[PDB]
Swiss-Prot record:
It catalyses: Hydrolysis of (1->4)-beta-linkages between N-acetylmuramic acid and N-acetyl-D-glucosamine residues in a peptidoglycan and between N-acetyl-D-glucosamine residues in chitodextrins. Residues 1-129 form the C-type lysozyme domain. In the egg white and polymorphonuclear leukocytes. GO terms for molecular function: beta-N-acetylglucosaminidase activity; identical protein binding; lysozyme activity. Monomer. The keyword Disulfide bond applies. This is Lysozyme C. Disulfide bonds join C6-C127, C30-C115, C64-C80, C76-C94. It comes from Gallus gallus (Chicken). PANTHER family: LYSOZYME C. One of its GO terms (cellular component) is extracellular space. Belongs to the glycosyl hydrolase 22 family.
């Protein structure tokens, strides 16, 4: 599923991501924009053989099981395919663990490089929230 901007903002809010660990909703929408272009089915291979999945490009190296990332962990206790669903529950619940790992949203390199320090509230402008 390819979400609209405000559609994704609303879904993220319903799943409790707004201000989760102090990160306003615009931060999460911005991260999703640059990680996946709001596409739940996005995947991308990493240099180490791991794969990133879903709207927030969650890596199989640590967070989900895809059966082909030898030596990895599955800390969100989910198949990576769950991160591709039209229902964002799995991606959100796993993102909540990730952002709690210590480095906050710096875990998403695209957030650090493209959202951090910018006017991220623009990403929820106009949305009914
Ligand atoms: Cl915001
Ligand atoms: Cl594996
Ligand atoms: Cl933080
Ligand atoms: Ho990535
Ligand atoms: Ho970590
Ligand atoms: Ho609201
Ligand atoms: Na894994």
């Amino acid at each position: 599923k390819v979400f609209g901007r405000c559609e994704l903002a609303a879904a993220m809010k319903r799943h409790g991501l707004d201000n989760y660990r102090g990160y306003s909703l615009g931060n999460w929408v911005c991260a999703a924009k640059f990680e996946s272009n709001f596409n739940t089915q996005a995947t991308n291979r990493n240099t180490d053989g791991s794969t990133d999945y879903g709207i927030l490009q969650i890596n199989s190296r640590w967070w989900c099981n895809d059966g082909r990332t030898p030596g990895s962990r599955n800390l969100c206790n989910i198949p990576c395919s769950a991160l591709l669903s039209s229902d964002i529950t799995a991606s959100v619940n796993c993102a909540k663990k990730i952002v709690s790992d210590g480095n906050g949203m710096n875990a998403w390199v695209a957030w650090r490089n493209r959202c951090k320090g910018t006017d991220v509230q623009a990403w929820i402008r106009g949305c009914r929230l």
